[PDB]
Amino acid sequence: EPWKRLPPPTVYPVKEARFEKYIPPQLDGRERALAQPPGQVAIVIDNGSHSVRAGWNFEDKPRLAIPPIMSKYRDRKMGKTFSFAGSDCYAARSHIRNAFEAGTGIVSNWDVMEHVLDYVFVKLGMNEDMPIVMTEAVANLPYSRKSMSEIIFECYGAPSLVYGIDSLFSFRHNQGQTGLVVSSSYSATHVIPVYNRKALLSQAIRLNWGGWHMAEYMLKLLKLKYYTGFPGKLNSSQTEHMVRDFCYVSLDYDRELAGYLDWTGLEDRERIVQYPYTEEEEELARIAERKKESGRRLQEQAAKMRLERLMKKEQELEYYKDIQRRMQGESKKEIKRLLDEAELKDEAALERVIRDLERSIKRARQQRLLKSNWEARQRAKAEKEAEKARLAEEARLDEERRKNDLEGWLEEKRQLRLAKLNQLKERERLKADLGNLEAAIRSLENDLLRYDKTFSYDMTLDAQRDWSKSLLHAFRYGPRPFDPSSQAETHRVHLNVERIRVPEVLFQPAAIAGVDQAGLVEIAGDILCQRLPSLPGIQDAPDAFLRDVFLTGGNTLFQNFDERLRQGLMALLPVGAPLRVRRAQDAILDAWRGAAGWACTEEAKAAWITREEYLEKGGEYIKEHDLGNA
Amino acid sequence: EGEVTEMTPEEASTLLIGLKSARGQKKLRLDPSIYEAIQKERVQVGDVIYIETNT
Amino acid sequence: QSAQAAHQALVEQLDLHSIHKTFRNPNWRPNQRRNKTIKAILGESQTNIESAPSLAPMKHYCDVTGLPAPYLDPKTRLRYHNKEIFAMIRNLPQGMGEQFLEARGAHTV
Ligand SMILES: Nc1ncnc2c1ncn2[C@@H]1O[C@H](COP(=O)(O)OP(=O)(O)OP(=O)(O)O)[C@@H](O)[C@H]1O
Ligand SMILES: [Mg+2]
């Protein structure tokens, strides 16, 4: 059997957002910053909903990368307040709040945002004056721009601030002259057309699906898969690591999906994630004796009721035979009068009752009464012994039938098996409503198994009911048997179809998760084919953009994401179009690197807003520039 | 041979038919008479059609 | 116990509340109800117009297993792959069909 042949399963421990070590204030960064030439130093903050990434413009990578979360609480034992603002929170008490509105790119809890920024400036080593470059959501809300500016200029007093878009910084860092920028991030997916290094933000589109939504959706699907119960505490922080580690984009979803749960090869399509389970004769002899006596008592009680039914049925039988002894040679009125004493109405009803009692009985001062009761048991024993005689010789006759008419005898077993299955079907398909054989079926199928070379176990009724012929076992537990007793085989989830079903929401949002928005290929194709050729200032559209479709943000890092997008776009473009899909180098940090390289250029310093310009114009005002919002 | 993407009139009668395959799209200017052949076949947008453009 | 003392020592080392932020302006204080939701912020409009719908026909998937679904149940309104999953779907507990709809973001309440 396959589960006996298959190797032991390979299993992956659950991963979650966890603290690992402290990091001190990085005073060498402050030292290096004070050493830079005038107007060539800035603090660069990539304000990401998954990670805030921060560092110095003159360095090649962030010094900090922390979730935009705070935890603040009063210790009920020690009696003092504690406060935390990143991965310093163990994501020990997880009183967590998040700066962003859940599943969106917009900051809305400004108290968390200040705590996150306090942690940033502390760990960058600021103690008392530095220009700030901060990334911003596409089409970011003016109220959030205002609130962020107020914090930067009036809480922290910074000399100058500029906002730009993480998608576009990533593009310019990778030599983006002109192209279609495709960003899938934690919060969102965007397609932005970029022309002559300037983004055409009036033509940008947002999907409202991203790496957060995939973690939440993977969580819903797992809580549905194991809806009858799962012992581990399923958190979307865990399903995020499952989506990172195990999910991939299909190159032909319907053909890969339709075969995914087929038992052959599911061993290699499944992946198994295991939660931290706990491993759990005089005693037994005495208890078993008490059980054995209790069972014996139940057996005696059944036999005592059976013996009461034996004596009752034999006494009933004797009475009905006493009628028959009269009825033979007596009138219909005597027949009717004796039947009326039974309140029966037919001699053959007495025959049926006489036989049916015998058919039941065969299965199962004082001395004259006691022995005549024992003689009713001897009348029962005569039915019981005649039953024994009947069965022994009838079986020997059938053994001759097997020897003498083997093929017809096999053909009989088929005809009987079907007829018995028909009665079971006539029972069950009806009783499935009307409720509001089996050993005979087996015995027939057993001889068919024994000697009918046309028969197989796969047609056995039990095989129709077997777990390894089911689909939901493959879905929930894969190629291998399952028992709830094993603490190691409980506490594990089998990902199966969700390996591919979760990434495919980007391509099929309404069909898979009901998002009611166009898929990624349809968004990009609407821009390339319908919009940009209509926009009158543009030249060489679409073709100039097709030469660089560019992938950015962590939620693009799925395997086959590029080739899926290429093959999807290839069918929407005219034949021989020079379509190139390209990945960013290091598609997460690369948006910060773009902001850092841009930070002190003349283009950036023309776009900087000073504290005094902020006091003049207010916090909604922005210098419009290639990499930022209008 | 492709999925019909477009069937647009371009004459007072000449169509443009757009055809699509998994590997790209092409547009064909149709002679008024092969257009009627395509119209006698019950072709619509989203149908898959075969055309011998020479014959 | 030393483990608990070391744990509190680590939590004390991690604590921001013990730190005076010398770079903060001590004078400025926010409006304590600045934390408006996106819904509330858009309520000030009386540019997040970047969302897009679709008109292509929608493929049908099984609500239980995600496999392709030929069938839509009249009763539960769940889509399902085969007779085995139809048997499951009509044997669901009293609130569970609505949870399968909620993964599509469908509701009947
Ligand atoms: N190798 C990977 N494969 C797939 N997904 C990944 C991988 N690494 C990270 N992710 C996911 O991608 C997302 C990270 O996106 P990214 O950090 O680029 O965005 P962000 O700047 O935090 O977000 P936003 O711009 O929406 O505010 C998370 O959902 C993360 O789980
Ligand atoms: Mg981002």
PDB file of C-alpha atoms in Angstrom, chain A residues 10-16 18 237-239 241-242 245-246 271-277 491-493 495:
ATOM      1  CA  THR A  10       9.719  15.776   6.008  1.00  0.00           C
ATOM      2  CA  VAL A  11       8.414  18.445   8.386  1.00  0.00           C
ATOM      3  CA  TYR A  12       9.174  22.156   8.981  1.00  0.00           C
ATOM      4  CA  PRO A  13       8.932  23.899  12.379  1.00  0.00           C
ATOM      5  CA  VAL A  14       6.582  26.856  12.742  1.00  0.00           C
ATOM      6  CA  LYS A  15       8.237  30.256  12.383  1.00  0.00           C
ATOM      7  CA  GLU A  16       6.906  33.489  13.866  1.00  0.00           C
ATOM      8  CA  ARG A  18      10.400  36.737  17.280  1.00  0.00           C
ATOM      9  CA  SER A 237       2.424  36.070  11.825  1.00  0.00           C
ATOM     10  CA  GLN A 238       2.969  32.339  11.290  1.00  0.00           C
ATOM     11  CA  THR A 239       1.088  32.202   7.982  1.00  0.00           C
ATOM     12  CA  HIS A 241       6.319  32.862   7.162  1.00  0.00           C
ATOM     13  CA  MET A 242       4.393  30.018   5.505  1.00  0.00           C
ATOM     14  CA  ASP A 245       8.658  29.863   2.603  1.00  0.00           C
ATOM     15  CA  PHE A 246       6.206  27.648   0.707  1.00  0.00           C
ATOM     16  CA  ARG A 271       4.527  20.538   2.684  1.00  0.00           C
ATOM     17  CA  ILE A 272       4.051  19.954   6.408  1.00  0.00           C
ATOM     18  CA  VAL A 273       4.353  22.638   9.112  1.00  0.00           C
ATOM     19  CA  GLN A 274       4.513  21.450  12.731  1.00  0.00           C
ATOM     20  CA  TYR A 275       3.531  23.345  15.897  1.00  0.00           C
ATOM     21  CA  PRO A 276       5.306  22.719  19.256  1.00  0.00           C
ATOM     22  CA  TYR A 277       3.383  19.744  20.661  1.00  0.00           C
ATOM     23  CA  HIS A 491      -0.350  19.903  15.716  1.00  0.00           C
ATOM     24  CA  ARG A 492       0.743  19.835  12.037  1.00  0.00           C
ATOM     25  CA  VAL A 493      -0.838  21.584   9.021  1.00  0.00           C
ATOM     26  CA  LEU A 495      -0.501  23.263   2.969  1.00  0.00           C
TER      27      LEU A 495
END
